[PDB]
Amino acid sequence: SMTKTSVDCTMYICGDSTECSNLLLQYGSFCTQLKRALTGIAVEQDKNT
């Protein structure tokens, strides 16, 4: 097994500013696919043990 990691879309891209999150919702599902891919790694890391 490897080290299980998780990446937040809000805290990494935006500095908790109101102008960053308004243009982030126009980009949509770009970090939704990247969040659920790392979730699907962390399920399979427990299945390897």
Binding site: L23, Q26, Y27, G28, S29
Partner: protein, 48 residues
């Protein structure tokens, strides 16, 4: 003939009552369905 016919009859009763044994093949449909449904929602967002 009592042991082999009763053991194969429990396989037929398990697949009819419980569909969870085929759920590994149901994910192969579900990994293809969630990939196509996310890809067709890219046109609604304005990309900046």
């Amino acid at each position: 003939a009592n042991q082999f016919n009763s053991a194969i009859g429990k396989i037929q009763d398990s697949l009819s009552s419980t569909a969870s044994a085929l759920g590994k093949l149901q994910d192969v449909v579900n990994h293809n369905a969630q990939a196509l449904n996310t890809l067709v929602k890219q046109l609604s967002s304005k990309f900046g």
